[PDB]
From Swiss-Prot, chain B:
Its EC number is 5.2.1.8. This is FK506-binding protein 1. It is found in: Cytoplasm. Its main location: cytoplasm. Keywords: Cytoplasm, Isomerase, Rotamase. The keyword Cytoplasm applies. It comes from the Eukaryota. Inhibited by rapamycin. One of its GO terms (cellular component) is cytoplasm. Belongs to the FKBP-type PPIase family. FKBP1 subfamily. One of its GO terms (molecular function) is DNA-binding transcription activator activity, RNA polymerase II-specific. InterPro entries: FKBP-type_PPIase, PPIase_dom_sf, PPIase_FKBP_dom.
Amino acid sequence: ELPQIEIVQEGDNTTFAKPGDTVTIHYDGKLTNGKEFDSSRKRGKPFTCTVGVGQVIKGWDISLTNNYGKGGANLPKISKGTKAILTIPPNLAYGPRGIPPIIGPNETLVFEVELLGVN
Amino acid sequence: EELPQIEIVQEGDNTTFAKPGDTVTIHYDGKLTNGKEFDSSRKRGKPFTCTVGVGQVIKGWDISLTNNYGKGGANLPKISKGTKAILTIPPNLAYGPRGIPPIIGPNETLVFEVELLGVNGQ
């Protein structure tokens, strides 16, 4: 149903991504065991995508858009400049199948995310 | 960005519009370009209710019903409550290069006749 969000750093709290908005982020992808599958920084650029439109895993879409603007209980809003940890259950990520050998079947994913800008 | 082809057969209220995360109720008939029907609300015997804009249905439906997630599109008319439309959905907005055989074949364009009966229950 819903991902888990923890706020490392608060952001302006006025600019929020909306579905179909563009966002730019820095991120860390780790499995629960602490081993890293993807990272923007090591790639060498921040990552820009369209959120809320199924262009990224559902857990990102929910987190970045605050559940498509509906919101949820215990879903803190994420705003420009926010730094957070996102814990995403497999159905909000790559599912029962996974994407082997990159990500195994039924994996929860932990993301360190910083929202640099919206649109 | 691919967009579905939407034709307004009959205008609706022009006031009630679904947004992402809204619920909608619709009557629909789905046919292949050769005119063969593959799915219908009538065959179900009830209209179909779902959440739009969240990847719960094929992308073509999500775009059509939310007017590209509230962004709009070139030549993309808005669909409002009471609208009857025909939606032509290219394979990448439906089921893909693969398909879901035998229900729907590979690389298939889908043509839907839709009526939007309600938004969020009303």
